[PDB]
Write a protein that binds this ligand. Structure first.
Ligand SMILES: Cc1ncc(COP(=O)(O)O)c(CN[C@@H]2C[C@H](N)[C@@H](O)[C@H](O)[C@H]2O)c1O
Ligand SMILES: Cc1ncc(COP(=O)(O)O)c(CN[C@@H]2C[C@H](N)[C@@H](O)[C@H](O)[C@H]2O)c1O
Lengths: 414, 414
C-alpha cells in the first residue's frame, strides 16, 4: 500500500517552483549591468546604488530607519553580533533548535554559544530556559523565529531589558511576520535576515541587518566594508562612496548590486506571497488536526505569521517505534515533495563539530566551554524525533494541494 | 596652471566604463531566473548548477582540476587558510603591501599575520624577508601578485618546500596571468581570487579557490557550505545535492547562481580584455619612462601580466617632499580619472586596528602578537610614500588615452 514499500504513490506531479521571479527583475538586472558599478565598493557614478535602494525599501518595509544589506544571513548574524560588542569568551544565549549556522556564527566571532531549550508547541526559545541560562558572562540573546512561529517577544524583551542584554532577532525564517503589529526584527536590538534560495525573500544568496539605532548600523557598516562606511553625502562621480573612516575594523560582507536589485523587486511581491501561504496553512492545520497531528503554534502576541516551513508533530501513540526519517521518507514518496524531519538539536548535529576545527582550538577552558556534550535539550530532541516539516513552496498552490498533504499523512498513519 | 590650483584641466572626456558586461549575461541570468534553484544549497533540479559550470570553466582556465567558487576574495582566502589546517595562534607570513584583507583574513581564522617586506621594484613578497621571518610557529605563506606584477614563485616555492609550508597565491589582482607558462594560482598549494567590482574578472562580488589537490578542494567545499559537499553524482530531482557528510564543520560562503552565471559569461572575454590592457600598458611604460617615472616591474619568468592596476614610482629627487595624496589629487584633476596613492603598508593602514575588535581579545600573549606596532617594513613604507596608481579601466582605451596619462604626469611634474 505505501509507495516506499512498492505501493502506488498518491501523488507524483510537480509542486510550485521556487523561487518566483518578480516581473521587474530582468530590467533591474539590465540596469545594473550597464551602471558601471556592480558593488557598493565600486566608485560613485552619479545615482543611488541598488545596495542603498534596497536598504531604504527594506527598512521602510520593516518600519525602522536603518538597514545594512549583506552577503548572507550568516554574515548578518556575525555583523550584528560584533556590532553588539560580542567577542572572545562572551556567552551568547541561542535556541538549541535551529539550522547549524545559529551555533557556528557565535563560534565564528569567538563567543561561546549557550544552547537553550525551546517551547514544545512553538519551538521557539523558552523564556524560562533563558533566565536559567543567564550567567555573569552572558552578553547577548539570539532568538530565532523558527519555521512558521514567532517567539515570545514580550517575555524575551522583558528579560533582555532587565538584564541589560542586547536581544537579536534572527528573522531568516520569518520575513514580513509581525508581533503586536511590529515587523519582526524591529522589536529589539537588531534584526538579521537570510535571502538564501529557500527563504521567502530571496536573491539566491543574501542578507540584511536592520535596526532603529544609527550608531549600531554605522558599526555594522564598518564591519561589512573593511572598516569603511558610506559618506553622508554622495561624492563626485569617479570617487569612492565608501570612505576609509576606520572607526572600527571590518571585513568584506558586501551584497552585490545584482542581488540588491533582485531583492528590491522580490520585496514588492512578498506580502502577496505570504498571504497565499498563510491561507493554505490555515486550511492544512484543520485537516491535520482532524488526524491528531499537532501543527506548530505561535506565541501569544503574534499578529501575522510567515510560513518559511510548515512543521507538524506526529500524534502521540502513532508510529512511535518508527524512526522519523522513515516516516518522512514514506511521506515524501506519497506526496512527490520533500517532507523532512525537524533539524537535529544543534549540539547533537553532525555538522556541529567545533573540535574538528583548529580555528577554535583556544586552550582547554574554552574547549570545555564549547564542547557540545554539555548541552541536553529535552524538548529539542523530542521535537527532532517527532516533527516533520515541509518547505513553503508546498503552501504556494491551491487549497486542493492541502488535501493531498492531508491524504499522504492519513495513508502513512496506516 | 594646475586644474587643482584653479586652472584648466587637460582632459574632461569620460573614460571606459567598467565593468563591461558580456553579451551572454542577460540570457544566462534569465535562465537562472526560471530554474527553480538560485543557489547550490537549493535542491537539485535535474541540471548542472551555474556554480558547477563556472567552477569547471575556471579550473580548466587555470590548468588545474579543482575549483570551489565562493562569495568573495575575502572568503576565498579564509577558506584556503582553514583548508591548510591553519588555526588559533598559527603564524602566517604575508606581504606588508596589499589591500587590508590580506591581514584581516588571517586574523579571522585566529592566526597571527606576519607582515614581510617586498621587492622594491616588483612590490611583491621578498624571498629574503620570508626566510628571515620563519619561526617554528609558521604554518603558511601567503603571497600576493600585486597590482600588475607576479612574485618570484620559484624562489617562494623553494622556501615553502624547504620548510614544509603550504604556499597560497592570492591572485585577486592577477586573473589569467602566467608564470613560466603556468596560470597564476596553479603554482603552489592553492589559488584565491576576488571577483569584486573592480577586479578584471567580476560579478560585483565573488571569488574562487583553485587547487590540484582533490582532498583540499573537498575541505574547501565543506568549509563554504556549512559542513556539506556536493554529491559525487547528482541525486533525484528535488533532493539536496549538498550532502551532510559530517567530515568537516564549515560556514556559508556560497556564491549565488546569479553571480556564477555572470562569471561564466565574463570569463569568455577575459583574455581579450587582458590583451588590450597589456598593449596599452606597454606603450605607457615608454612614455612614463621618458619622464623619469619607474613603472612597477614583474618577476623574471613572468610570461604574461594581468593589469588590475597600473602602479608607478615617482622620479627620485622630484616632488620629493610633496605628500603622495597631494600629487595624486593633482593628477586626478588633470585626467578626469582617479589616480591614487599605493596602499599603505598594512600595519600602518588605518583600516587595520585589531584592538578595535573584541573578537580578537584572546589573551595578552595573543593580543601582543597581533599588534601591528611590532612591524617595521622599510621598502613597503618607501613605495607607499612614492607610488601612485591607476585602476585598469584607464588601460581599456586607445593610445591617445595613454598620452593623456603621460601628459597629466608631465604637467604635474611642474
Ligand atoms: C535561522 C537561520 N539563521 C541563519 C541562517 C544563515 O543564513 P545563510 O548564511 O543565508 O545561509 C539560516 C539559513 N538557513 C538555511 C537552512 C537550510 N536548511 C540550509 O539548507 C541552507 O543553506 C541555509 O540557508 C537560518 O535559517
Ligand atoms: C590581494 C587581495 N586579496 C583579497 C581581496 C579581498 O577580496 P574581496 O573580499 O572580494 O573584496 C582583495 C580585494 N581588494 C579590493 C581592493 C579595493 N581597493 C577595495 O576598495 C575593494 O573593496 C577590495 O575588493 C585583494 O585585492
Amino acid at each position: 500500500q505505501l509507495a516506499v514499500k512498492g505501493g502506488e504513490a498518491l501523488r507524483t506531479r510537480p509542486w510550485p517552483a521556487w523561487p518566483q521571479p518578480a516581473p521587474g527583475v530582468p530590467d533591474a538586472v539590465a540596469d545594473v549591468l550597464g551602471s558601471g558599478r556592480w558593488s557598493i565598493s565600486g566608485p560613485y557614478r552619479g545615482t543611488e546604488s541598488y545596495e542603498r535602494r534596497f536598504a531604504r525599501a527594506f527598512a521602510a518595509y520593516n518600519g525602522v530607519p536603518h538597514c545594512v544589506p549583506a552577503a548572507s544571513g550568516t554574515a548578518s548574524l556575525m555583523l550584528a553580533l560584533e556590532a553588539c560588542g560580542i567577542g572572545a569568551g562572551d556567552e551568547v544565549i541561542v535556541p538549541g533548535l535551529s539550522w547549524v549556522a545559529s551555533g557556528s556564527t557565535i563560534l565564528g566571532v569567538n563567543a561561546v554559544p549557550i544552547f537553550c531549550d525551546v517551547d514544545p508547541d512553538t519551538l521557539c526559545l523558552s523564556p524560562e530556559a533563558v533566565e536559567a541560562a543567564i550567567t555573569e558572562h552572558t552578553r547577548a540573546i539570539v532568538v530565532v523565529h523558527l519555521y512558521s512561529a514567532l517567539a515570545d517577544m514580550d517575555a524575551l524583551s522583558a528579560i533582555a531589558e532587565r538584564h541589560g542584554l542586547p536581544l537579536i532577532e534572527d528573522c531568516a525564517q520569518a520575513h514580513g511576520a509581525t508581533y503586536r503589529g511590529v515587523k519582526v526584527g524591529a522589536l529589539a536590538t537588531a534584526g538579521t535576515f537570510s535571502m538564501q534560495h529557500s527563504k521567502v525573500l530571496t536573491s539566491g544568496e543574501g542578507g540584511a541587518v536592520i535596526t532603529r539605532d544609527e550608531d549600531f548600523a554605522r558599526r555594522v557598516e564598518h564591519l561589512r566594508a573593511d572598516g569603511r562606511c558610506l559618506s553622508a553625502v554622495p561624492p563626485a562621480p569617479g570617487a569612492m562612496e565608501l570612505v576609509e573612516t576606520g572607526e572600527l575594523m571590518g571585513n568584506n560582507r558586501c551584497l552585490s548590486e545584482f542581488q540588491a536589485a533582485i531583492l528590491a523587486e522580490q520585496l514588492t511581491i512578498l506580502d502577496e506571497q505570504n498571504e497565499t501561504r498563510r491561507a493554505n496553512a490555515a486550511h492544512l492545520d484543520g485537516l491535520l488536526g482532524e488526524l491528531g497531528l499537532r501543527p506548530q503554534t505561535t506565541s501569544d502576541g503574534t499578529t501575522s505569521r510567515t510560513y518559511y516551513t510548515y512543521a507538524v508533530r506526529l500524534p502521540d501513540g502513532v508510529l512511535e517505534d518508527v524512526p522519523v526519517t522513515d516516516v518522512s521518507c514514506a511521506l515524501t514518496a506519497e506526496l512527490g515533495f520533500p517532507v523532512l524531519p525537524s533539524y537535529a538539536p544543534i549540539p547533537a548535529n553532525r555538522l556541529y563539530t567545533p573540535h574538528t576545527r583548529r580555528r577554535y582550538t583556544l586552550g582547554l577552558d574554552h574547549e570545555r566551554r564549547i564542547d557540545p556534550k554539555r548541552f541536553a535539550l529535552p524538548v529539542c530532541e523530542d521535537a527532532a524525533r517527532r516533527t516533520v516539516t515541509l518547505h513553503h513552496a508546498a503552501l504556494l498552490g491551491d487549497a486542493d494541494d492541502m488535501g493531498d498533504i492531508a491524504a499522504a499523512f492519513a495513508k502513512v498513519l496506516r
